Amino acid sequence: GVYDYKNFGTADSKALFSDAMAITLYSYHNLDNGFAAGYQHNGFGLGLPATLVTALLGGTDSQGVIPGIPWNPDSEKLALDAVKKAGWTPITASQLGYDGKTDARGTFFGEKAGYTTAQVEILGKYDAQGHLTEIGIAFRGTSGPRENLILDSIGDVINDLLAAFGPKDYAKNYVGEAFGNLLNDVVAFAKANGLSGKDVLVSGHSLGGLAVNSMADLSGGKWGGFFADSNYIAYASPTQSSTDKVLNVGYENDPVFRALDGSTFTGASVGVHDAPKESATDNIVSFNDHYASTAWNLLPFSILNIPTWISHLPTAYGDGMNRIIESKFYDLTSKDSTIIVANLSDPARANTWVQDLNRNAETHKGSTFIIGSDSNDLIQGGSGNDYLEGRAGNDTFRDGGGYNVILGGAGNNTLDLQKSVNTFDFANDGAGNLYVRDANGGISITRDIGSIVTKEPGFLWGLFKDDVTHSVTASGLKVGSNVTQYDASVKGTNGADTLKAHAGGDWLFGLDGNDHLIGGVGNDVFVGGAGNDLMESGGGADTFLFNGAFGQDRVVGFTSNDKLVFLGVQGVLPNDDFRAHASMVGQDTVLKFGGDSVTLVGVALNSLSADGIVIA
Ligand SMILES: [Ca+2]
Ligand SMILES: [Ca+2]
Ligand SMILES: [Ca+2]
Ligand SMILES: [Ca+2]
Ligand SMILES: [Ca+2]
Ligand SMILES: [Ca+2]
Ligand SMILES: [Ca+2]
Ligand SMILES: [Ca+2]
Ligand SMILES: [Ca+2]
Ligand SMILES: [Ca+2]
Ligand SMILES: [Zn+2]
Ligand SMILES: [Zn+2]
Structure with a gap:
């Protein structure tokens, strides 16, 4: 902290x-x-x-x-x-x-x-x-x-x-x-x-x-x-x-x-x-x-x-x-973390986006934390990795890219994507996390955001142009009777599950417990969740996502076209790369983040590239 x-x-x-x-x-x-x-x-x-x-x-x-x-x-x-x-x-x-x-x-x-x-x-x-x-x-x-x-x-x-x-x-x-x-x-x-x-x-x-x-x-x-x-x-x-x-x-x-x-x-x-x-x-x-x-x-x-x-x-x-x-992000921070505190007057808060302007300061390094007020905030994250916290009030968020966690908190909150819904993928674990993936592959994990705003250059579905407000629901993003479906998924339980991806690729959500996630030949996204999860690529260009107290996981079949994403995890000093967290144990590379770890089974540390291991 x-x-x-x-x-x-x-x-x-x-x-x-x-x-x-x-x-x-x-x-x-x-x-x-x-x-x-x-x-x-x-x-x-x-x-x-x-x-x-x-x-x-x-x-x-x-x-x-x-x-x-x-x-x-x-x-x-x-x-x-x-x-x-x-x-x-x-x-x-x-x-x-x-x-x-x-x-x-x-x-x-x-x-x-x-x-x-x-x-x-x-x-x-x-x-x-x-x-x-x-x-x-x-x-x-x-x-x-x-x-x-x-x-x-x-x-x-x-x-x-x-x-x-x-x-x-x-x-x-x-x-x-x-x-x-x-x-x-x-x-x-x-x-x-x-x-x-x-x-x-x-x-x-x-x-x-x-x-x-x-x-x-x-x-x-x-x-x-x-x-x-x-x-x-x-x-x-x-x-x-x-x-x-x-x-x-x-x-x-x-x-x-x-x-x-x-x-x-x-x-x-x-x-x-x-x-x-x-x-x-x-x-x-x-x-x-x-x-x-x-x-x-x-x-x-x-x-x-x-x-x-x-x-x-x-x-x-x-x-x-x-x-x-009080921040839900507090335990992610360290002494020199970049933290932007929303301290606007009531009139300025109404129309000013809280963001890292980097004014009158040396260039900021590492992830950025933006802490809202208990009133209605406008919060803008940058193109790097951001942790945005709205707290109470009806908050509106924007973000410029990268890998992010966005916490709406109490109230009716909105994520304004400023681009077409067609450029994004959306997934949902049924445990309150809505995942938003941009065209460049950046992922935001969001909670308590019930409205998504997109900007449509054409008439979406042949009906709606310009700013479109979608409701976040169990069945997808809804505009009246129109639905933008979530990406194909397999959801587990809070006990130990074996989940199998289909050939077309799936988000695999293990949730709590020690899970066995069997990827397929398609492009899968593995979210082991809490517990010690065994996750097998199965082929394709796969993503393995790690957040919070993610446990001691084992990843099998990791290749150069796959990606690890560490987002909202322990022990990350500003601008750390994977080498700061890596060691060899026998024939496996082990990455440690506080008390949590990922073992890349049968992968030599010298074979890894920073581009394949995102540390936010
Ligand atoms: Ca210092
Ligand atoms: Ca400074
Ligand atoms: Ca707020
Ligand atoms: Ca809020
Ligand atoms: Ca960002
Ligand atoms: Ca489970
Ligand atoms: Ca699990
Ligand atoms: Ca796969
Ligand atoms: Ca692969
Ligand atoms: Ca896990
Ligand atoms: Zn006493
Ligand atoms: Zn297996």
Whole structure:
């Protein structure tokens, strides 16, 4: 998964991520709530006010209206209730034995000159008996005195701040200077409750993300090394620690995220700075109104241009990245997967296709994941391999080719093929999967798409020209009484079956159980499904399709004109080819994908070509 952390499993890493996000949102106390709601309702026509940037960098005072920044009057209670829902309650100064200042919200403040406006939330998670089990540390970083942020032009202010993070270890030492003593009290409190460093989660966004990286850098040497094994998840940080401890999560188009190289200012800091970084998720796009807009992108992309900060805002981090957490595709992803998150305003969503524009970024590699919203989305996949997720709402999908999985989710969903029905083949396993194969052989596996739209250059059946809507039914695609039939198939059961293809060629659907699929001399498509399936070509130009937890399969009679297709399988790093997954066991080539495998019986690995083995 994209948010895998240390050697935690996929699932444990997701839970940690969700907690990091929750405490990070809490640290802002709904600063951007009113703004986000205005954007969601109206779009980004009016851009982003400098006051919001200075609020993010310098903090505020506090709960109320600031010019440019609509204020949700319930900001505070909403934020507290949300962090409590996530399992967290602020820990009091009294509980920590902390002699210093906390405010009305329970927020802790920085300790030394230059840091006295820096903020941190210290939170506890408890079991059902009320025993402390986890401590959360959410940094809300600030740049220094607020009053400095308006002494120059906003661009000059940002430029100067970036340039000052690196010299004399400013960024590195930030948390030691701001919170050195408080963190000693946290150690004692943790120990008094039987917790160790591994029970502490450290997070924060923006300059709070800078703070997360600082604490990680200092954790080996300060506080007796107590926090060396703590969990560090930083959002939208301009910096990266020199440790291997921090998961640096951000949107690719967020101009703050990865602005510095470690903490070093480079020639890319005020432009596009999308070079891969080991600690960072490098290819998660916030598909928002700015990213989508020709007008908004006329000027060169730069952190010094305030409108670009739309992609830095925390509400879209929380909402967008939680949708990644919830995705049916989550377990297919890895740290540097290309993931496009639908983050459009309501007006833009109505007529803008969510797609990988690859704007202001290095060329994307590997499969692409596009994650919709709970409203009606227009989602466009590219000519490569795509995983498109509509979620709730009535979603419309387009896709440019290749091998794809398209999940309609709840609602009445549509796949618009933009070409004649005559150029496609359609198959259906009776288990909810509708397979669409294009004229070039690309296959989309679709679920919960009940309507197919085609574009007809002539009168289909002598009746319908231009856009034609077909209903997906058990007997084929229907337009009134007209039917486009599914390709010849043999369907099994969820037990062990032997299925035999006819000479003309069949889709063979084994479904669950350990199946025995006997192809014929014709061109067959083998879908063994779950279980350990034995699949025999029988001759012809055959396709073997593998999706999900597909088991340990054996393929007999594989020749050069046959094809393996791995689509929605485990262990695929961006742009992997078959060699990354291949080995010889005796006389057979074995291809491994996580815990699943395909054995090509009596095939030497050196005889294989990438053209015959599709890895999506
Ligand atoms: Ca990376
Ligand atoms: Ca990138
Ligand atoms: Ca949707
Ligand atoms: Ca849907
Ligand atoms: Ca595609
Ligand atoms: Ca079966
Ligand atoms: Ca099976
Ligand atoms: Ca065959
Ligand atoms: Ca063959
Ligand atoms: Ca199987
Ligand atoms: Zn307990
Ligand atoms: Zn057999």
